A paper describes a structure:
Therefore, each chamber has three complete sets of catalytic domains including three acyl-carrier protein (ACP) domains. Substrates are shuttled between the static reaction centers by the mobile ACP domain flexibly tethered at its N and C termini.
With the ability to observe ACP at the ER and redirect this mobile domain to the KS, we focused on conformational differences within the ER catalytic region of C. albicans FAS. This site within C. albicans enzyme represented the most pronounced alteration in ACP localization upon stalling catalysis at the KS-domain. The observation that stalling catalysis at one site (i.e. KS) can affect ACP localization at other sites (i.e. AT and ER) in the presence of substrates within the context of the fully assembled reaction chamber strongly suggests that substrate loading state of the mobile domain may be a contributing factor in ACP-mediated substrate shuttling in type I fungal FAS.
Numbering used by the authors:
A (entry chain B): 341 to 510
B (entry chain B): 1190 to 2037
C (entry chain A): 1 to 93
């Protein structure tokens, strides 16, 4: 809000992904995000500052922030128009998914896709383009082992999902 | 598809038909070549019919660049400019073009909440079908096929708005240079592109009909001369040029220095003899009112000459008004290899966008016919590439900063080639940055593009210091080092000593404690009369406009007068502020001499720098008037306070830091404090300086109220009881009495010391040491009318060039930018209750 | 407004502006907030003997225009003629 108080809503910044408790992803015009982390570099402190001798409540906030190698303002209003164009391209073809078998938890709502009154594609696109991501809320599991097939691996979603469910025995 | 057709035509004649397809309408067009077959000779069995060859090539290219729509008309006049055609710049064209050049500058991609901008290189897209029509006319007859694009140059008209995505744009271009160089027939065209009639930018292209041509009859050249500034000092000089029959003055006014803005029209008869020269131009005189009036004209006219005499005479006997001031050492903008580009794979995308279907870049067969290394990249593309490069690497991706760009197609680039460019800032012009570039083929290191770009500076603003910062030796290093700066100290002191009897340079250099003016012989009396004539006004209790004398000590008997300042004369207000305005104007002028001043600057000054500002940026007054008004102001505000026996006052000024008192002590805190402490003791006390929020406030008034306040601020600091912290503890009225419980105890102390109370430093108060006049306060409000008189007779109304004041000037009375709107008059009049401005505000309608 | 009408207007307005400036408080805080916000100037060049306004501008930046510059990614560079000779003349070693 400090940052957006200076800019119009076409450069407004919004929360995009919630990767956990202290793991968030912001989206917006790259220069605006640049300014935001500029504010941060002021309100923040270096990592080797040794606040051991100053009591707790009056310590300086410490963080780690850097741009992800992504080249699109996903899960924001910045692509709100692309939603209709993409689903129109869908209507251009026979792109649709039949009834599911394993329940798939929604990312934003957290509900099951088998309980969808709409098709699934029109939902998943609005889910990728505009709506944010509530990951841990979406992965409110009843699960023993978790398999990530995504990219990165040792740097992938697996590691942060691990750190999210550390003591739940998964 | 068929690209080549060789076939017999009517007996013993061959028609080599060279075909090209990718056209305006993709309609295949043929380039008919003719060759005569000769069985008689075998050593040369086939000779090409050379007659009418250029016309066959020209009609081909006409159908190319225009399409079979317009009939090939070769009868184009060279003299008249060539018209273009109104085209609407749409967003789709902009996008296609930017993609074709690979430009990422976000000012051109459509973003919400911001006007879609078009690239400056789009003018050639707008003006090509107008530019190239200049090489078609019959008089310029040559091998159209061996044509080479030599150089291109962009130049935005100073103050022109860059293109938007709705602009209805037309194009007018005229041909300037047609000269048979030893390398061929050069042709230069300049295109003045229009927007609703107003011209926006100029594009200067440069082609070359390579080969050899001796048509010295249809060759010519029109050039505008560099504006030369000739200075006349002796008496022969004025007769020297008056002897020149080509010189012809029409006004019989004396002149010191003259600026010659001229243009010529050459017509050649051989390599170097000029069959005709018509060089007309204007001679201009710079008045002290900064109004430039043409003294006369220049009219030379001759035949079979070897040079333009007017230009030569201007060169050796006068210096030009040069604009490209060069550094002695250029600076590299960025170092490394991050400035590397790559040629496209195919030139067809660029061709279909730029409308340039030149088959040199698209077809192997033509590129081979001209024996050139292959389908080389479009030169215009290579231009726009480096342009978009420097647009971000030199202007930090700010599009509107580039205002002119010119380059020279030194070499050719085949597609897909990787190009590395260097980028260098070498000089300055009109406050915008000169940036020189070289794009060399990185795998061969030979240069390809040597160019030049004029990009703006960051949005700058100039503030000028006020009084209080004075010290001995101001700019004396600059005065000893900068000629143009020395010419303002010398222009000013020799005005002082000849009108007031002292050298300001001596005052600033060896600051003494006293100065004795002497009214000696004739010119001695001719000075003391000036001192006598100074009659200022201080509205007394009578209110009458008492045209009273400043120096009651100077009369028809006083032979000599003495000034005294115990600290040093450089501290006396009437002498310090001339020194300050001189040093500031000297620095400003020396800077401007280097072409360091942007055109969109905003300026202001702090209570003295204001005068040195509107005299510098707006040049409202020459130096001789500026020193007079600043000296008269110093004296007026000086004698304005009734003094003691020593010349000292019961008045003073103090600077306060509202932070050192308490973190809760806001701007409203100390201003409410001044309001109450001045309204109770019925003394005069004002904060006159709003310098820094809660860090620097400077209050003025009688020493009594000043110490009363420097003590209320001490006792509210030791008690930490803030008036704003009483707003939640007390009401609005009972705080007005709460502060009374405190202000009386310290008003007693204000009266407890000798009335000219030497203000002692409070807890968070640092008084103004050295001055005792409460300037910018309503106390001096009486003495304004005489100063207002002095201004309206020292400031020539004709010198006011308001266009540079609107928005660019921030007064200190009204901190919003100067601008002549009715509300602005309202805001200033409700702040000063003037008569002259309210009078014009009532009858405001006399504006449009 | 015809150039002659506005010239009369500008002349009289400027005359009275300077005349009463002599006795009316200098409104420099808001002047700074104008030439820093309404214009967002990058280079602020003070000309004088001592950087009395450079120190008067750095504090204004650090007080009221930090979040504004960060939100807009502006790197305001203050410069005074006293010390910043090489930097204003664009010929710095």
């Amino acid at each position: 809000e400090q940052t957006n108080s200076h800019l119009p809503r076409e450069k407004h910044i919004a929360i995009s992904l919630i990767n956990g408790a202290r793991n968030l992803v912001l989206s917006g015009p790259p220069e605006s995000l640049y300014g935001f982390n500029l504010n941060l570099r002021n309100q923040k402190a270096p990592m080797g500052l040794d606040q051991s001798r100053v009591p707790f409540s009056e310590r300086k906030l410490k963080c780690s922030n850097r741009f992800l190698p992504i080249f699109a303002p996903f899960h924001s209003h910045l692509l709100a128009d692309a939603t209709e164009l993409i689903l129109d391209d869908v209507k251009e073809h026979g792109l649709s998914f039949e009834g599911l078998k394993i329940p798939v938890y929604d990312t934003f709502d957290g509900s099951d896709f088998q309980a969808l009154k709409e098709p699934i594609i029109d939902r998943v696109v609005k889910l990728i383009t505009e709506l944010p991501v509530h990951w841990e809320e979406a992965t409110n599991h009843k699960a023993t082992h978790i398999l990530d097939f995504g990219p990165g691996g040792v740097s992938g979603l697996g590691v942060l999902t691990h750190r999210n469910k550390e003591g739940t025995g998964a | 598809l068929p690209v080549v057709e060789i076939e017999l035509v009517k007996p013993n004649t061959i028609q080599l038909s060279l075909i090209e397809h990718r056209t305006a309408d993709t309609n295949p067009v043929a380039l008919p070549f003719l060759y005569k077959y000769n069985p008689a000779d075998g050593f040369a069995p086939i000779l090409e019919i050379m007659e009418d060859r250029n016309e066959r090539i020209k009609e081909f290219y006409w159908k190319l660049w225009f399409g079979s729509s317009v009939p090939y008309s070769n009868d184009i006049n060279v003299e008249k400019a060539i018209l273009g055609d109104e085209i609407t710049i749409s967003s789709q064209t902009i996008s296609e073009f930017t993609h074709a050049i690979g430009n990422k500058c976000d000012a051109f991609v459509d973003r919400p909440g911001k006007a879609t901008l078009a690239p400056m290189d789009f003018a050639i897209v707008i003006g090509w079908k107008a530019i190239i029509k200049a090489i078609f006319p019959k008089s310029v007859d040559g091998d159209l096929l061996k044509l080479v694009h030599l150089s291109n140059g962009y130049k935005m008209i100073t103050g022109a708005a860059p293109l938007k995505k709705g602009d209805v744009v037309s194009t007018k271009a005229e041909i300037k240079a047609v000269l048979n160089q030893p390398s061929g027939k050069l042709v230069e065209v300049v295109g003045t592109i229009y927007r609703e009639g107003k011209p926006v930018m100029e594009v200067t292209s440069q082609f070359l009909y390579r080969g050899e041509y001796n048509d010295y009859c249809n060759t010519f050249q029109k050039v505008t001369e560099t504006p030369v500034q000739v200075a006349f000092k002796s008496a022969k000089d004025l007769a020297v040029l008056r002897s020149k029959e080509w010189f012809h003055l029409e006004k019989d006014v004396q002149f010191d220095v003259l600026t010659f803005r001229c243009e010529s029209t050459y017509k050649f008869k051989s390599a170097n003899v000029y069959s005709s020269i018509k060089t007309t131009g204007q001679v201009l005189l710079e008045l002290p009112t900064k109004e430039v009036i043409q003294v006369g004209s220049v009219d030379y006219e001759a035949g079979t000459s070897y040079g333009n005499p007017v230009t030569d005479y201007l060169s050796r006997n006068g210096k030009t008004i040069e604009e490209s001031v060069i550094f002695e050492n250029a600076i590299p903008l960025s170092s490394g290899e991050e400035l590397t580009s790559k040629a496209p794979g195919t030139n067809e995308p660029y061709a279909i966008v730029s409308g340039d279907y030149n088959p040199i870049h698209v077809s192997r067969v033509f590129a081979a016919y001209a024996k050139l290394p292959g389908t080389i990249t479009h030169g215009m593309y290579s231009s726009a590439s480096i342009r978009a490069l420097v647009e971000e690497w030199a202007a930090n991706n700010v599009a509107a900063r580039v205002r002119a760009f010119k380059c020279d197609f030194v070499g050719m680039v085949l597609p897909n080639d990787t190009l590395q460019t260097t980028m260098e800032h070498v000089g300055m012009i009109n406050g915008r940055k000169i940036i020189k570039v070289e794009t060399r083929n990185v795998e061969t290191e030979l240069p390809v593009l040597i160019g030049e770009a004029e990009i703006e500076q960051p949005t700058t603003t100039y503030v000028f210091t006020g009084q209080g910062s004075q010290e001995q030796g101001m700019g004396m290093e600059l005065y000893n080092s900068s000629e143009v700066a020395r010419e303002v100290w010398d222009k000013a002191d020799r005005h002082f000593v000849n009108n007031y009897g002292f050298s300001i340079l001596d005052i600033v250099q060896n600051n003494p404690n006293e100065l004795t003016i002497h009214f000696g012989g004739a010119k001695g009396r001719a000075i003391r009369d000036n001192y006598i004539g100074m009659m200022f006004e201080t509205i007394g209790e009578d209110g009458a406009l008492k045209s009273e004398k400043i120096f009651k000590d100077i009369d028809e008997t006083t032979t000599s007068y003495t000034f005294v300042s115990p600290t040093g004369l450089l501290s006396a207000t009437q002498f310090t502020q001339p020194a300050l305005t001189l040093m500031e104007k000297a620095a400003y002028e020396d800077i401007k001499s280097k072409g360091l001043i942007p055109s969109d600057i905003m300026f202001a000054g702090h209570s003295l720098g204001e005068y040195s500002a509107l005299s510098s940026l707006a040049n409202v007054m020459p130096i001789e008037s500026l020193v007079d008004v600043v000296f008269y102001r110093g004296m007026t505000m000086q004698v304005a306070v009734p003094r003691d026996e020593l010349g000292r006052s019961n008045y003073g000024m103090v600077a306060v830091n509202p932070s050192r008192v308490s973190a809760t002590f806001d701007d409203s805190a100390l201003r409410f404090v001044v309001d109450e402490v001045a309204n109770k003791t019925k003394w005069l006390l004002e904060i006159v300086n709003y310098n820094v929020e809660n860090q620097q406030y400077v209050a003025a008034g009688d020493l009594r109220a000043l110490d009363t306040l420097t003590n209320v601020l001490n006792v509210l600091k030791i008690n930490k009881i803030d008036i704003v912290k009483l707003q939640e503890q007390m009401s609005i009225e009972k705080v007005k009495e709460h502060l009374y419980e405190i202000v009386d105890e310290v008003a007693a102390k204000s009266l407890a010391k000798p009335q000219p109370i030497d203000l002692e430093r409070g807890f968070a108060v640092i008084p103004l040491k050295g001055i005792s006049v409460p300037f910018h306060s309503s106390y001096l409000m009486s003495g304004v009318k005489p100063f207002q008189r002095f201004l309206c007779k020292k400031i020539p109304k004709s010198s006011v060039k308001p266009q540079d004041l609107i928005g660019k000037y921030i007064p200190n009375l009204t901190a919003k930018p100067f601008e002549l709107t009715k509300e602005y008059f309202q805001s200033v009049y409700d702040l000063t209750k003037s008569e002259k401005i309210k009078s014009i505000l009532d009858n405001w309608e006399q504006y449009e | 407004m015809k150039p002659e009408i506005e010239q009369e207007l500008s002349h009289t307005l400027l005359t009275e502006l300077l005349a009463y400036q002599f006795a009316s408080p200098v409104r420099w805080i808001e002047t700074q907030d104008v030439f820093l916000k309404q214009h967002n100037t990058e280079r602020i060049i003070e000309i004088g003997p001592s950087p009395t306004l450079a120190g008067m501008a750095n504090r204004t930046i650090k007080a009221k225009y930090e979040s504004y510059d960060a939100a807009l990614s502006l790197q305001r560079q203050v410069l005074c003629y006293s010390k910043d000779a090489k930097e204003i003349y664009y010929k710095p070693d």
